[PDB]
Write a protein that binds this ligand. Structure first.
Ligand SMILES: *[C@@H]1O[C@H](CO)[C@@H](O)[C@H](O)[C@H]1NC(C)=O
Ligand SMILES: *[C@@H]1O[C@H](CO)[C@@H](O)[C@H](O)[C@H]1NC(C)=O
Ligand SMILES: *[C@@H]1O[C@H](CO)[C@@H](O)[C@H](O)[C@H]1NC(C)=O
Ligand SMILES: *[C@@H]1O[C@H](CO)[C@@H](O)[C@H](O)[C@H]1NC(C)=O
Ligand SMILES: *[C@@H]1O[C@H](CO)[C@@H](O)[C@H](O)[C@H]1NC(C)=O
Ligand SMILES: *[C@@H]1O[C@H](CO)[C@@H](O)[C@H](O)[C@H]1NC(C)=O
Ligand SMILES: *[C@@H]1O[C@H](CO)[C@@H](O)[C@H](O)[C@H]1NC(C)=O
Ligand SMILES: *[C@@H]1O[C@H](CO)[C@@H](O)[C@H](O)[C@H]1NC(C)=O
Ligand SMILES: *[C@@H]1O[C@H](CO)[C@@H](O)[C@H](O)[C@H]1NC(C)=O
Ligand SMILES: *[C@@H]1O[C@H](CO)[C@@H](O)[C@H](O)[C@H]1NC(C)=O
Ligand SMILES: *[C@@H]1O[C@H](CO)[C@@H](O)[C@H](O)[C@H]1NC(C)=O
Lengths: 67, 412, 99, 98, 49, 45
């Protein structure tokens, strides 16, 4: 559950920029937008299973081999 | 009927085009707006039915569409491309528009100018799905693809190509023979670098240049301020305040006064939601246009005259801006013409010759063929031209003698 | 009844000046006035460039120029007769007044 | 798998296309449409708050945009180019449209 | 009056779509030569007045 | 070699695959290299 625009003081528990997010687990590693949340956070059911929440990855990074 | 003006020189130009892409995502608790959570009004509002729920459904449609717009505009790229350590793009600058490492959010210098110059009674504002930092990575990715790999990252994987050759391509795309770039590379790099420099001064000079983005920010503040001010309205009721009425009057009398406040506040909220549905359609028309210019002007080169800055289009660079996008369209403009005598075809020995590409001209004393968009005379020859029938049918043909470059070798 | 109609900022004479300018540029200078100054070019050569833009070689114009001129002049004649003969063509504008 | 048709002749064609560009610029005084002359009724309308201004503002936004549409369509040209006095246009006759 | 102004906002948005289409045809079909099939009436496009 | 730009297909560099424009002095990053002449087999007929 996301409480949109709340600080957790007022309500696992995680503070996002979108709000105090409850029942999801914070993960530092970044992945595709599976479920959108807001302010770059997304959530998914990746595996032994729970809902995770993480900062989304915009795509694979690639330094083009220009000279 | 025998005069043509051909440009002997040109200017690279950089035209800044600014487009709205998204509104401030908004959702309103219609019960907290109308009733202030005071139960005697909520027990009346329940009797109006779907006018509670469907306004949140309508504003949720608007709120999701702001993320869909911003996704379609910026997330056209398949990978996050990033620029090499070396910056030797043939002399062409690429610094004020690439990321600045000192900027916390890795925006470019021109993105920072744009981010400076643009500027809860049951109402709620929702964050965008992509933060300003994430949008600034997509505008860096589209830019680093565009610098290192031309249009190829719009067709498949980015294929590297040296930047002077990518411009030689893009000249060859506007009917200028690519030698015109290489023979002028330092001048073209200086015209481009100077033209970028004028953008920083132009954007510094007045906030009135960003009017399209300052408008989408102003109109949403103006709509919500009016929606809040409409709480202070009677609509025929004894007072504009609900708990005041409920203190003054017995339930029978109070109910008729409150039902006016419900009707008035609800009609004001339907008016606001209807206006936002129409404003969101106008912003979506702008977001589809911006999503098109990413595809055609950034990821490509466009033949569409005056779709992509004035002059013939070479390339463009996107830069992010609050609630929108800015394109720096780079265009070739022909700039110093001379008048020349011309004829549609020439006669050799009993044969009409037409130019293969380019057009015939004379300085008044000699006849030449030149490419159409830059004066560069070449002696008229059997490879530069093709024959098509005798020396009669054409109107305004001239007499001449075409050189045939094989004949000196057939002297062997 | 408190309703009013405001004048347009450009009068129909000023629109006729702009359509005259667009048209006289298009006749004397091709596409070039959409980039630089209006570079003059002879109109038979401007059509040869526009034929070259559809994959038809320039000689197909000049070898048929007097024929092509008669086809164009006749076609404008049919437009002028068609618009003179019936009001039914202007539905897309008349509908905007009617609504 | 071995047949092609090629044109041996052409027609130049002229096709009319028609697009609307502006509504008739229209504006309403909401107090004069709703009330009209009555100071009594005009004072009663103040109880409805911002709608009188908001509706006249929306019609002003539409009315101003009609001038913008007309300039966005026709005012694309920097200079008023003048047609030359002598019509050496290789036989092509533009009298009807000049 | 609210019904009239709401319908005129929607009609004016349709006329804006037509005015942007006309400005696009002015830009491409007059000031240039379209290579976009059947954007400029049937046939291969030459010019428009 | 010279190729078409969207599919690797090497052509031997020749005076009909290519066009002249002035000296080397101004062209940044030019290299040397033979350009073959398709007339040469009958120049030496
Ligand atoms: C929330 O409350 C805590 C209380 O310690 C405060 O430190 C924090 O800055 C507040 N803001 C958020 C949204 O984290
Ligand atoms: C994320 O990084 C912080 C660094 O302080 C660490 O404490 C935390 O345990 C990490 N969480 C995960 C899921 O790795
Ligand atoms: C062409 O114009 C530029 C200015 O745009 C000028 O610096 C240059 O000297 C001119 N002539 C040449 C050499 O092309
Ligand atoms: C671009 O121009 C600026 C001018 O201040 C200069 O500092 C920067 O080094 C230049 N970048 C390149 C790589 O040309
Ligand atoms: C070309 O001719 C016109 C008219 O005589 C003249 O004004 C102009 O200076 C001449 N030169 C150019 C700029 O092509
Ligand atoms: C142009 O028109 C004049 C009209 O007097 C004519 O004498 C001249 O031969 C024409 N030139 C061409 C190129 O047709
Ligand atoms: C070209 O020369 C021929 C004679 O060889 C002559 O009949 C014809 O009129 C000349 N045409 C022009 C354009 O001077
Ligand atoms: C081509 O068609 C036109 C009529 O459109 C006709 O006048 C002309 O004679 C025809 N030419 C041929 C080659 O049949
Ligand atoms: C053009 O058409 C008009 C009206 O039919 C006519 O008076 C004029 O002589 C025509 N001019 C040409 C060049 O045929
Ligand atoms: C590319 O840059 C390097 C380092 O400046 C230089 O040594 C090399 O000669 C350059 N090559 C070209 C094609 O300019
Ligand atoms: C090509 O050869 C000449 C000597 O004939 C030499 O001066 C020049 O530097 C060479 N250029 C390259 C890029 O190898």
């Amino acid at each position: 559950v996301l409480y949109q625009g709340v600080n957790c003081t007022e309500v696992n528990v995680f503070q996002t920029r979108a709000g105090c997010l409850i029942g999801a687990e914070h993960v530092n590693n970044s992945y595709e937008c599976d479920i959108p949340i807001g302010a770059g956070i997304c959530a998914s059911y990746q595996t032994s299973q729970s809902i995770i929440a993480y900062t989304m990855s915009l795509g694979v990074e690639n330094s083009v081999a220009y000279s | 009927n025998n005069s043509i003006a051909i440009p002997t020189n040109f200017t690279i130009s950089v035209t800044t085009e600014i487009l709205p892409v998204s509104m401030t995502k908004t959702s309103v608790d219609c019960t907290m707006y109308i009733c202030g959570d005071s139960t005697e009004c909520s027990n009346l509002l329940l009797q109006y039915g779907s006018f509670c729920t469907q306004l949140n459904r309508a504003l949720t449609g608007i709120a999701v569409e702001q993320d869909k717009n911003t996704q379609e505009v910026f997330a056209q790229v398949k990978q996050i491309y990033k620029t090499p350590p070396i910056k030797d793009f043939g002399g062409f600058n690429f610094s004020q528009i690439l990321p600045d490492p000192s900027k916390p959010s890795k925006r470019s210098f021109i993105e920072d100018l744009l981010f400076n110059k643009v500027t809860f009674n049951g109402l709620t504002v929702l964050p965008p799905l992509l933060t300003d930092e994430m949008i600034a990575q997509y505008t860096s990715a589209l830019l680093a693809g565009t610098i290192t790999s031309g249009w190829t990252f719009g067709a498949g994987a980015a294929l590297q190509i040296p930047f002077a050759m990518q411009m030689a391509y893009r000249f060859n795309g506007i009917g200028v023979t690519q030698n015109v770039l290489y023979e002028n590379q330092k001048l073209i790099a200086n015209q481009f670098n100077s033209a970028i420099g004028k953008i920083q001064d132009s954007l510094s000079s007045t906030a009135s240049a960003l009017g399209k983005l300052q408008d989408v920010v102003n109109q949403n503040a103006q709509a919500l301020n009016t929606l809040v001010k409409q709480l202070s309205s009677n609509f025929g009721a004894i007072s504009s305040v609900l708990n005041d009425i409920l203190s003054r009057l017995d339930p029978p009398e109070a109910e008729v006064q409150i039902d006016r406040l419900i009707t008035g506040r609800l009609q004001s909220l339907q008016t606001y939601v209807t206006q936002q549905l129409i404003r969101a359609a106008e912003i979506r028309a702008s977001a589809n246009l911006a999503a098109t210019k990413m595809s055609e002007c950034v990821l490509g080169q466009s033949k569409r005259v005056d779709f992509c800055g004035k002059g013939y289009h070479l390339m463009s660079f996107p830069q992010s801006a609050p609630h929108g996008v800015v394109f720096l369209h780079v265009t070739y403009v022909p700039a110093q013409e001379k008048n020349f005598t011309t004829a549609p075809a020439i006669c050799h020995d009993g044969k009409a010759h037409f130019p293969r590409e380019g057009v015939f001209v004379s300085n008044g004393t000699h006849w030449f063929v030149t490419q159409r968009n830059f004066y560069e005379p070449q002696i008229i020859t059997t490879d530069n031209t093709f024959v098509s029938g005798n020396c009669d049918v054409v109107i305004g043909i001239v007499n001449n003698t075409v050189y045939d470059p094989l004949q000196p070798e057939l002297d062997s």
